[PDB]
Structure 1
Amino acid sequence: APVNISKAILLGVILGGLILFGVLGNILVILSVACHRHLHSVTHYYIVNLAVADLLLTSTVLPFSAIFEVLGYWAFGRVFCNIWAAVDVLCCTASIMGLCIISIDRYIGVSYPLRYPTIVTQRRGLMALLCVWALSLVISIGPLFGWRQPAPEDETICQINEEPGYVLFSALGSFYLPLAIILVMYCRVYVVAKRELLKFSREKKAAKTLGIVVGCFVLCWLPFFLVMPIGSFFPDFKPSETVFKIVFWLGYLNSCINPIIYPCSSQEFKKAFQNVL
């Protein structure tokens, strides 16, 4: 079923423009931190980590996914699809884990604004960063490696694991369990901010910025992680393919958007972006 080139050209151009916007935003978010030595810290390094996760999503996953969508079939080989799926599942996991370890950074930095640089330093936060990378890698490849469904005969048919056994714990350990550690850390941050100086004000401003980021991420991803398990349990209530398309693309455009939040929310990042431009 060769889709008309003219009809799908609009979709292809839209997806390409979104991917380029996300990529440029992600390089900008990293370049602002790197060039400016007035804007480096454990939380800023974690923001750069999230930017790198978005870069991995938008430089190795999006282009291929958009090509697959517009074409409608997987031109490349089986091994290439297997690596692409693993890269996707691990980059999303890396982004969410970065979020959940930014949720602890901004809980420590709000509960103890003055003693904060003592609990976490450039040597202690990096251990957590590497640990979360390792955890994301093992919880991403593991489900794929451990619970792969049999390889399809056709090279142009390569879709996600329909088996509930995988999807259940993959989603749970990739989104829901990391999401609990975010919703509890930010609940504590909010209650602390309400009940509760210059350092405290800066910490609360950074907490609010990262809270906007976390909210956007969670709201955008929740449709997919709520529909796919529901479809797994409830095959009778699986939505239309359009629903799947829109939810996946929302889960991607969230990473595409992520860069915009920093300039619009935090004035410091706004100056950094202006200087870099």
Structure 2
Amino acid sequence: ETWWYNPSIVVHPHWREFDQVPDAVYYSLGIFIGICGIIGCGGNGIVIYLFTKTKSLQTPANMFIINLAFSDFTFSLVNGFPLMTISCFLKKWIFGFAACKVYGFIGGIFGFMSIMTMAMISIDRYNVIGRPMAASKKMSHRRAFIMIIFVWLWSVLWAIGPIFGWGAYTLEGVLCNCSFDYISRDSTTRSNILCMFILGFFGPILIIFFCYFNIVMSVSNHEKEMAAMAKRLNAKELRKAQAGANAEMRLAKISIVIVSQFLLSWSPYAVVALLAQFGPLEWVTPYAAQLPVMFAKASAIHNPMIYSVSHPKFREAISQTFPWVLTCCQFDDKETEDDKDAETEIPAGE
């Protein structure tokens, strides 16, 4: 009678008026997300393993990185295999409503968690690079720990709504994965959506911009400052300080790329969702929603690869532990030089 009926979840009428996408599409979708499961869990596992165990990567701020990897690891695990991948190969989410809720809720909770964690990372960047060298402040375990606690509370807060009726996680697109209902336009649903977008998304974004734009509108504040202290009878020991700023700067740059990655990955889907809740629902087709959600889902598998091609200490560790990964990205000692000088302290003028 129908090719979309789910005896465990009521499919919104909107996704029911369409025809059922070809088998090949379901199979590809399954294989696709499954491979995000592998790369995602694999790569984030590696960052969690190496960062918690390498001596070099032992500073408080790195906790954010670990927190981000835990976030992306779980996203990739829960959102790929087996909940979605298996659903695809059968062309039906066979894991019932509760699974669906857990799935959608986990997806939202860690998507909110990866940007907010990046926000905390953008803050650390601002304290070490965004403020004047004289006031430069490094991350402390105390601060860091409190910050991630905020991250977790925050993330759960803006994602748990649909768990209590203030919105809802249900099926979308080809009905083989779960998400938050962006179709239904009632007061309740719409407020939760507005909350998700503004508190969950725009929020950490402001923190990010305010921190990076603050690091940019300080490159010169630092440019001058570097000189004033430079000619300040500061011996060749000035090089040390310089290397440190380079080293930190590089990390700050990294931060921005992963943030860019996040935004480029989610914004599309975000947009398609808003059209469905505020614009021509007739646009949000099976593929209009599906394809942009896959692009979003894979977001949680990028940071680890970004780190492996631009994070020196991390790249060092990999060469020393799972060095096979660094094949096409060969390691070398020169990549760690700026970190060497930045810490090779000088004994009383030396």
Which residue of structure 1 lines up, in the alignment, with residue 37 of structure 2? 19
Which residue of structure 2 lines up, in the alignment, with residue 80 of structure 1? 99
Q: Give 2:47's aligned amino acid.
A: V
- The DSSP-based 3-state class of the residue aligned with 1:99 is helix
Q: Does 1:51 align with 2:69?
A: yes
- The DSSP-based 3-state class of the residue aligned with 1:53 is helix
Change (3 A) 1:224 1:106: same
Which residue of structure 1 lines up, in the alignment, with residue 115 of structure 2? 96
Shift of 1:54: 0.3
Q: Give 1:141's aligned amino acid.
A: I
- The DSSP-based 3-state class of the residue aligned with 2:158 is helix
Shift of 1:108: 1.0
Which residue of structure 1 lines up, in the alignment, with residue 304 of structure 2? 259
Shift of 1:9: 4.0
Which residue of structure 2 lines up, in the alignment, with residue 206 of structure 1? 251
Q: Does 1:160 align with 2:186?
A: no
Q: Does 1:66 align with 2:85?
A: yes
Q: Does 1:111 align with 2:116?
A: no
Change (3 A) 1:71 1:47: same
C-alpha distance in 1 between matches for 2:141 and 2:46: 22
Q: Give 2:320's aligned amino acid.
A: N
Q: Does 1:176 align with 2:202?
A: yes
Q: Could you tell which deviates more after superposition, 179-188 or 106-115?
A: 106-115
Q: Could you tell which deviates more after superposition, 129-138 or 3-12?
A: 3-12
Q: Could you tell which deviates more after superposition, 170-179 or 126-135?
A: 170-179
Contact 1:76 1:156 in 2 (8 A): no
Which residue of structure 1 lines up, in the alignment, with residue 143 of structure 2? 124
Change (3 A) 1:242 1:127: same
Shift of 1:230: 2.6
- The DSSP-based 3-state class of the residue aligned with 2:61 is helix
Structure 1: give runs of 5+ residues left out of the alignment. Answer: none
Shift of 1:3: 7.8
Which residue of structure 1 lines up, in the alignment, with residue 52 of structure 2? 34
C-alpha distance in 2 between matches for 1:41 and 1:176: 29
> Cα deviations across residues 30-59 of structure 1 (Å, max 9, x unaligned)?
111122111111221101110000011011
Q: Give 1:160's aligned amino acid.
A: F
Q: Does 1:188 align with 2:214?
A: yes
Which residue of structure 2 lines up, in the alignment, with residue 238 of structure 1? 283
C-alpha distance in 1 between matches for 2:177 and 2:248: 49
C-alpha distance in 1 between matches for 2:144 and 2:119: 13
C-alpha distance in 1 between matches for 2:170 and 2:300: 30
Q: Could you tell which deviates more after superposition, 230-239 or 30-39?
A: 230-239
Contact 1:54 1:256 in 2 (8 A): yes
Shift of 1:183: 1.8
- The DSSP-based 3-state class of the residue aligned with 2:95 is coil
- The DSSP-based 3-state class of the residue aligned with 1:235 is coil
Q: Could you tell which deviates more after superposition, 215-224 or 48-57?
A: 215-224
Q: Taking structure 1 as the reference length, what is the TM-score of the superposition?
A: 0.88
Shift of 1:16: 1.9
Q: Give 1:266's aligned amino acid.
A: H
Equivalent residues, number: 274
Contact 2:84 2:176 in 1 (8 A): no
Contact 1:100 1:178 in 2 (8 A): yes
Contact 1:50 1:95 in 2 (8 A): yes
Shift of 1:4: 7.4
Structure 2: give runs of 5+ residues left out of the alignment. Answer: 4-19, 224-241, 323-350
Which residue of structure 1 lines up, in the alignment, with residue 273 of structure 2? 228
Change (3 A) 1:157 1:97: closer
Percent identity (aligned): 24
Change (3 A) 1:151 1:203: closer
Q: Give 2:85's aligned amino acid.
A: A
Q: Taking structure 2 as the reference length, what is the TM-score of the superposition?
A: 0.70
Change (3 A) 1:33 1:183: same
C-alpha distance in 2 between matches for 1:92 and 1:157: 15
> Cα deviations across residues 103-139 of structure 1 (Å, max 9, x unaligned)?
1111111134565455x31111111111111111112
Shift of 1:12: 2.9
